[PDB]
Design an enzyme around this catalytic site. Structure first.
Site, PDB file in Angstrom:
ATOM      1  N   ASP A   1       0.889  -1.133   0.059  1.00 37.33           N
ATOM      2  CA  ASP A   1       0.013   0.048  -0.053  1.00 37.33           C
ATOM      3  C   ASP A   1       0.808   1.121   0.016  1.00 37.33           C
ATOM      4  O   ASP A   1       1.683   1.372   0.777  1.00 37.33           O
ATOM      5  CB  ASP A   1      -1.024  -0.245   1.267  1.00 37.33           C
ATOM      6  CG  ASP A   1      -1.998   1.081   1.077  1.00 37.33           C
ATOM      7  OD1 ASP A   1      -2.875   1.124   0.337  1.00 37.33           O
ATOM      8  OD2 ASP A   1      -1.635   2.251   1.898  1.00 37.33           O
TER       9      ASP A   1
ATOM     10  N   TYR B   1       2.923  10.044   0.484  1.00 42.33           N
ATOM     11  CA  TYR B   1       4.024   9.656   1.587  1.00 42.33           C
ATOM     12  C   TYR B   1       5.470   9.864   1.214  1.00 42.33           C
ATOM     13  O   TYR B   1       6.144   9.962   2.055  1.00 42.33           O
ATOM     14  CB  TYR B   1       3.760   8.037   1.693  1.00 42.33           C
ATOM     15  CG  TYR B   1       2.345   7.659   2.087  1.00 42.33           C
ATOM     16  CD1 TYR B   1       1.395   8.342   2.730  1.00 42.33           C
ATOM     17  CD2 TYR B   1       1.926   6.212   1.914  1.00 42.33           C
ATOM     18  CE1 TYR B   1       0.268   7.929   2.996  1.00 42.33           C
ATOM     19  CE2 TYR B   1       0.593   5.668   2.259  1.00 42.33           C
ATOM     20  CZ  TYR B   1      -0.269   6.676   2.796  1.00 42.33           C
ATOM     21  OH  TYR B   1      -1.338   6.201   3.243  1.00 42.33           O
TER      22      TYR B   1
ATOM     23  N   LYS C   1      -2.621   5.946  -4.606  1.00 41.60           N
ATOM     24  CA  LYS C   1      -3.674   6.941  -4.400  1.00 41.60           C
ATOM     25  C   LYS C   1      -3.407   8.213  -4.782  1.00 41.60           C
ATOM     26  O   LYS C   1      -2.201   8.680  -4.668  1.00 41.60           O
ATOM     27  CB  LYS C   1      -3.786   6.945  -2.629  1.00 41.60           C
ATOM     28  CG  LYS C   1      -3.749   5.763  -1.836  1.00 41.60           C
ATOM     29  CD  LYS C   1      -4.120   5.912  -0.432  1.00 41.60           C
ATOM     30  CE  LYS C   1      -3.969   4.394   0.285  1.00 41.60           C
ATOM     31  NZ  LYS C   1      -2.481   4.341   0.629  1.00 41.60           N
TER      32      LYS C   1
ATOM     33  N   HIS D   1      -7.797   9.306  -2.566  1.00 43.41           N
ATOM     34  CA  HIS D   1      -7.040   9.216  -1.131  1.00 43.41           C
ATOM     35  C   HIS D   1      -7.971   9.800  -0.030  1.00 43.41           C
ATOM     36  O   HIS D   1      -8.257   9.298   0.823  1.00 43.41           O
ATOM     37  CB  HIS D   1      -5.574   9.935  -1.193  1.00 43.41           C
ATOM     38  CG  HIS D   1      -4.769   9.473  -0.110  1.00 43.41           C
ATOM     39  ND1 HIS D   1      -3.364   9.447  -0.134  1.00 43.41           N
ATOM     40  CD2 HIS D   1      -5.005   9.020   1.275  1.00 43.41           C
ATOM     41  CE1 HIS D   1      -2.973   9.123   0.817  1.00 43.41           C
ATOM     42  NE2 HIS D   1      -3.839   8.814   1.857  1.00 43.41           N
TER      43      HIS D   1
HETATM   44  N1  LIG Z   1      -5.802   5.658   3.102  1.00 46.95           N
HETATM   45  C1  LIG Z   1      -5.638   6.625   4.168  1.00 46.95           C
HETATM   46  O1  LIG Z   1      -6.023   7.726   4.382  1.00 46.95           O
HETATM   47  C2  LIG Z   1      -4.555   5.963   4.931  1.00 46.95           C
HETATM   48  C3  LIG Z   1      -4.443   6.465   6.425  1.00 46.95           C
HETATM   49  C4  LIG Z   1      -3.545   5.623   7.064  1.00 46.95           C
HETATM   50  C5  LIG Z   1      -2.856   4.615   6.931  1.00 46.95           C
HETATM   51  N2  LIG Z   1      -2.944   4.281   5.812  1.00 46.95           N
HETATM   52  C6  LIG Z   1      -2.196   3.012   5.324  1.00 46.95           C
HETATM   53  O2  LIG Z   1      -2.103   1.944   6.188  1.00 46.95           O
HETATM   54  C7  LIG Z   1      -0.885   1.748   6.743  1.00 46.95           C
HETATM   55  C8  LIG Z   1      -0.983   1.298   8.107  1.00 46.95           C
HETATM   56  O3  LIG Z   1      -1.627   2.173   9.082  1.00 46.95           O
HETATM   57  P1  LIG Z   1      -0.413   3.142   9.814  1.00 46.95           P
HETATM   58  O4  LIG Z   1       0.880   3.175   9.300  1.00 46.95           O
HETATM   59  O5  LIG Z   1      -1.177   4.308  10.311  1.00 46.95           O
HETATM   60  O6  LIG Z   1      -0.071   2.383  11.434  1.00 46.95           O
HETATM   61  P2  LIG Z   1      -0.245   0.974  11.634  1.00 46.95           P
HETATM   62  O7  LIG Z   1       0.008  -0.062  10.733  1.00 46.95           O
HETATM   63  O8  LIG Z   1      -1.556   0.716  12.705  1.00 46.95           O
HETATM   64  O9  LIG Z   1       0.833   1.092  12.761  1.00 46.95           O
HETATM   65  C9  LIG Z   1       2.133   1.092  12.386  1.00 46.95           C
HETATM   66  C10 LIG Z   1       3.030   1.338  13.750  1.00 46.95           C
HETATM   67  O10 LIG Z   1       3.089  -0.092  14.419  1.00 46.95           O
HETATM   68  C11 LIG Z   1       4.343  -0.587  14.428  1.00 46.95           C
HETATM   69  N3  LIG Z   1       4.328  -2.116  14.444  1.00 46.95           N
HETATM   70  C12 LIG Z   1       4.379  -2.625  13.240  1.00 46.95           C
HETATM   71  N4  LIG Z   1       4.145  -3.988  13.460  1.00 46.95           N
HETATM   72  C13 LIG Z   1       4.447  -4.192  15.017  1.00 46.95           C
HETATM   73  C14 LIG Z   1       4.569  -5.090  15.749  1.00 46.95           C
HETATM   74  N5  LIG Z   1       4.260  -6.398  15.261  1.00 46.95           N
HETATM   75  N6  LIG Z   1       4.920  -5.167  16.928  1.00 46.95           N
HETATM   76  C15 LIG Z   1       4.701  -3.905  17.516  1.00 46.95           C
HETATM   77  N7  LIG Z   1       4.580  -2.572  16.673  1.00 46.95           N
HETATM   78  C16 LIG Z   1       4.461  -2.913  15.436  1.00 46.95           C
HETATM   79  C17 LIG Z   1       5.294   0.258  13.778  1.00 46.95           C
HETATM   80  O11 LIG Z   1       6.664   0.143  13.770  1.00 46.95           O
HETATM   81  P3  LIG Z   1       7.823  -0.002  13.226  1.00 46.95           P
HETATM   82  O12 LIG Z   1       7.607   0.564  11.697  1.00 46.95           O
HETATM   83  O13 LIG Z   1       8.865   0.873  13.752  1.00 46.95           O
HETATM   84  O14 LIG Z   1       8.182  -1.599  13.299  1.00 46.95           O
HETATM   85  C18 LIG Z   1       4.507   1.439  13.426  1.00 46.95           C
HETATM   86  O15 LIG Z   1       5.118   2.316  14.542  1.00 46.95           O
HETATM   87  C19 LIG Z   1      -0.286   3.136   6.608  1.00 46.95           C
HETATM   88  O16 LIG Z   1       1.286   2.761   6.356  1.00 46.95           O
HETATM   89  C20 LIG Z   1      -0.771   3.317   5.003  1.00 46.95           C
HETATM   90  O17 LIG Z   1      -0.201   2.509   4.231  1.00 46.95           O
HETATM   91  C21 LIG Z   1      -3.907   4.867   4.734  1.00 46.95           C
HETATM   92  O1  LIG Z   2      -3.800  10.386   4.839  1.00 52.23           O
HETATM   93  C1  LIG Z   2      -2.860   9.341   4.919  1.00 52.23           C
HETATM   94  O2  LIG Z   2      -2.710   8.367   4.149  1.00 52.23           O
HETATM   95  C2  LIG Z   2      -2.207   9.253   6.257  1.00 52.23           C
HETATM   96  O3  LIG Z   2      -2.030  10.488   7.007  1.00 52.23           O
HETATM   97  C3  LIG Z   2      -1.542  11.580   6.400  1.00 52.23           C
HETATM   98  C4  LIG Z   2      -0.252  11.158   5.421  1.00 52.23           C
HETATM   99  C5  LIG Z   2       0.460  12.111   5.321  1.00 52.23           C
HETATM  100 CL1  LIG Z   2       1.908  11.781   4.265  1.00 52.23          CL
HETATM  101  C6  LIG Z   2       0.286  13.539   5.498  1.00 52.23           C
HETATM  102  C7  LIG Z   2      -0.958  13.666   6.337  1.00 52.23           C
HETATM  103  C8  LIG Z   2      -1.944  12.995   6.807  1.00 52.23           C
HETATM  104  C9  LIG Z   2      -2.529  13.223   7.540  1.00 52.23           C
HETATM  105  O4  LIG Z   2      -2.859  14.534   7.976  1.00 52.23           O
HETATM  106  N1  LIG Z   2      -3.870  12.286   7.520  1.00 52.23           N
HETATM  107  C10 LIG Z   2      -5.084  13.068   8.097  1.00 52.23           C
HETATM  108  C11 LIG Z   2      -6.177  13.661   6.984  1.00 52.23           C
HETATM  109  C12 LIG Z   2      -5.488  14.070   5.972  1.00 52.23           C
HETATM  110  C13 LIG Z   2      -6.568  14.673   4.973  1.00 52.23           C
HETATM  111  C14 LIG Z   2      -7.859  14.742   5.234  1.00 52.23           C
HETATM  112  I1  LIG Z   2      -9.018  15.588   3.686  1.00 52.23           I
HETATM  113  C15 LIG Z   2      -8.213  14.490   6.691  1.00 52.23           C
HETATM  114  C16 LIG Z   2      -7.535  13.658   7.365  1.00 52.23           C
HETATM  115  F1  LIG Z   2      -7.971  13.394   8.308  1.00 52.23           F
END
Ligand SMILES: NC(=O)c1ccc[n+]([C@@H]2O[C@H](COP(=O)([O-])OP(=O)(O)OC[C@H]3O[C@@H](n4cnc5c(N)ncnc54)[C@H](OP(=O)(O)O)[C@@H]3O)[C@@H](O)[C@H]2O)c1
Ligand SMILES: O=C(O)COc1cc(Cl)ccc1C(=O)NCc1ccc(I)cc1F
Length: 316
Positions: free
Chosen positions: A44, A49, A78, A111
């Site tokens: 993803d 990012y 995205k 996104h």
């Molecule tokens: N569409 C959107 O708007 C949106 C928004 C948010 C997220 N996303 C996507 O979803 C992905 C995942 O969400 P997220 O990055 O917000 O957070 P997450 O996956 O809920 O948590 C990531 C955190 O958990 C830690 N971690 C991972 N595996 C672990 C384990 N086995 N034990 C302990 N800690 C662990 C990581 O540390 P380390 O990396 O240091 O190991 C990092 O600090 C994002 O990276 C992105 O690709 C999309």
């Molecule tokens: O949007 C994501 O995928 C994760 O969150 C972020 C990632 C980056 Cl690189 C920069 C900013 C954010 C962030 O503030 N996300 C929260 C957010 C963004 C845009 C809108 I519209 C609403 C939100 F809650």
């Protein structure tokens, strides 16, 4: 449980993927290489990012090494908010393709439902700190996404952070050509999303759960916020199953027929997080985890709350 879920475009999507938001550019190439080596087939990504070039280096090396074939990978990116305009969508997609070193994406998402003023800044603000909207709407942006399918740049299109009314609006779009394949939304035991998930699933839209571990590295984390990984109740369920808390948190959405995309740059955790196909949470475990809902969001942003299309005013 099978490793892939069938999308409404006829393609199969791996139910576990690697997240890349916050993965530092000097660490994400190795993270993705390790992930592919240990079995991940879904990554993803997003332009916002700022690490797609480095993700792409890893993907390309593993393709060149013949560790995996391109057809076996499922690469998601995205469209950022500053590219909602008709004349910008293709170029935004192409920049992502060029950075990832791909000739197509498996899935390309809007996104967020909100369009922002185009320009260099990802969050253009007025002098009082409000995001500056664009007059684009989700329907015209969707038509631009449909064109990408018809041009061969992407195999599937979808949405992210769309609320139920916004999903409905896309589904009810006059002249709709392709339904969204996926809605990617925040989902974990503190934000269980039962209403929105049931709606999407009932329409054949696959839901991807982001921040499944509660995003402990989100840059706006406060020392007081609730913590999934440290919740003793979830720890107890993990202990009972001889798994880690993270493994329970990843398995949970899988059993709800969701796709899930935990992020890590730690090689041991990348491997740990993949070892989730050989145990099952009971129905009682599932209902117990659901009971922890408190409507708590990682992903919300004050500067964007007055945008007409900001998604989190509606209940769901
Ligand atoms: N569409 C959107 O708007 C949106 C928004 C948010 C997220 N996303 C996507 O979803 C992905 C995942 O969400 P997220 O990055 O917000 O957070 P997450 O996956 O809920 O948590 C990531 C955190 O958990 C830690 N971690 C991972 N595996 C672990 C384990 N086995 N034990 C302990 N800690 C662990 C990581 O540390 P380390 O990396 O240091 O190991 C990092 O600090 C994002 O990276 C992105 O690709 C999309
Ligand atoms: O949007 C994501 O995928 C994760 O969150 C972020 C990632 C980056 Cl690189 C920069 C900013 C954010 C962030 O503030 N996300 C929260 C957010 C963004 C845009 C809108 I519209 C609403 C939100 F809650």
């Amino acid at each position: 449980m099978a490793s892939r879920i069938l999308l409404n475009n006829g393609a199969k999507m791996p139910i576990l993927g690697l997240g890349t938001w916050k993965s530092p550019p000097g660490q994400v190439t190795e993270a993705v290489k390790v992930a592919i080596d240990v079995g991940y087939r879904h990554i993803d990504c997003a332009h916002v990012y700022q690490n797609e070039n480095e993700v792409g280096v890893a993907i390309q090396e593993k393709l060149r090494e013949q560790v995996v074939k391109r057809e076996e990978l499922f690469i998601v990116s995205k469209l950022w908010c500053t590219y909602h305009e008709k004349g910008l969508v293709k170029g935004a997609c192409q920049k992502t393709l060029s950075d990832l070193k791909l000739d197509y994406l498996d899935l390309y998402l809007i996104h967020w439902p909100t369009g922002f003023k185009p320009g260099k800044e990802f969050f253009p603000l007025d002098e009082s700190g409000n995001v500056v909207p664009s007059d684009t709407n989700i329907l015209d942006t969707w038509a631009a996404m449909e064109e990408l399918v018809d041009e061969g740049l992407v195999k599937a299109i979808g949405i992210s952070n769309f609320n139920h009314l916004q999903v409905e609006m896309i589904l009810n779009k006059p002249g709709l050509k392709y339904k969204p394949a996926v809605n990617q939304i925040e989902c974990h035991p503190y934000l269980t999303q039962e209403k929105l998930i049931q709606y999407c699933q009932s329409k054949g839209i696959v839901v991807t759960a982001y921040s499944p571990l509660g995003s402990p590295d989100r840059p706006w984390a406060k020392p007081e916020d609730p913590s999934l990984l440290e919740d003793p109740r979830i720890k107890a369920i993990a202990a009972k199953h001889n798994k880690t808390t993270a493994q329970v948190l990843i398995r949970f959405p899988m059993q709800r027929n969701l796709v899930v995309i935990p992020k890590s740059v730690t090689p041991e955790r990348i491997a740990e997080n993949f070892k989730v196909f050989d145990f099952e949470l009971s129905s009682q475990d599932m209902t117990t985890l659901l009971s922890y809902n408190r409507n708590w969001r990682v992903c919300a942003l004050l500067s964007c709350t007055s945008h007409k299309d900001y998604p989190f005013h509606e209940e769901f």
